[PDB]
């Protein structure tokens, strides 16, 4: 958390339907989205972090 | 049925998984309940494949 890792992706056609097969307990609390309806959606940029 | 992980847990209406989509499924109203249990010890099983 002192240092971010922010990676602000280009245009690609990546799936969002590929992390389904992460770890266990992988919680998916979208306030704004949907999860299953994260496939047809066309986002402007994508901020990443960690 | 006999699913068992976390993947118990993601039942529920909506939320498209890698075990919840082709194992069960209900409609969009799930008027009902659901009951799941811990058969750590009842059905261990090591090739019951």
Redesign the interface.
């Known amino acids: 958390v002192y240092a971010w890792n922010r990676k602000r992706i280009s245009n690609c056609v990546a799936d969002y339907?590929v992390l389904?097969?992460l770890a266990?307990?992988?919680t998916?609390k979208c306030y704004g989205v949907?999860?299953?309806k994260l496939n047809d959606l066309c986002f402007t940029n994508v901020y990443a972090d960690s | 049925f006999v699913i068992r992980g976390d993947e118990v847990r993601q039942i529920a209406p909506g939320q498209t998984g890698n075990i919840a989509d082709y194992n069960y499924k209900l409609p969009d109203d799930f008027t009902g309940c659901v009951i799941a249990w811990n058969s750590n010890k009842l059905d261990s099983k090591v090739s019951g494949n």
């Open positions: 339907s389904y097969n266990p307990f992988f998916f949907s999860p299953t």
